[PDB]
Design a protein around this ligand. Sequence first.
Ligand SMILES: CCN(CC)S(=O)(=O)c1ccc(O)c(NC(=O)c2[nH]c(C)c(C(C)=O)c2C)c1
Length: 124
Amino acid sequence: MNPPPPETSNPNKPKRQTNQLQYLLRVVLKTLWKHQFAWPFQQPVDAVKLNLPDYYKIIKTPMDMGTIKKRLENNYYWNAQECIQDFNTMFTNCYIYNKPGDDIVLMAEALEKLFLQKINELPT
Ligand SMILES: CCN(CC)S(=O)(=O)c1ccc(O)c(NC(=O)c2[nH]c(C)c(C(C)=O)c2C)c1
């Protein structure tokens, strides 16, 4: 069945507000969230509902934009690179589990390109 979703808070970790973190939420995440192809990435893969019994056998480091959004809202991330890493993991999982030309792969590609375009303008 499904694992618990990734942690979206850490009570043991100090919190900070930064221009980069705020940009990641309000510009980067927000723009990807609203793309027509965002929906498969807005929540963890529900392998039970979707009947994908091997998904969590193959994908041991799941990640999704719903988790990333909550992490940003919760100040889970101290370093902006942590957030960027989570995006990378999310896209990479898609390329691990699926095949060239699958709908989901084409959707990930479009989102990843948009991600690159938005991160390009990450503030210093
Ligand atoms: C419409 C309502 N849903 C979304 C809110 S849904 O019912 O959960 C729903 C219905 C049908 C679906 O095909 C999905 N698919 C996915 O989400 C999804 N995402 C990723 C990253 C993958 C893989 C395998 O990489 C898959 C299969 C989700």
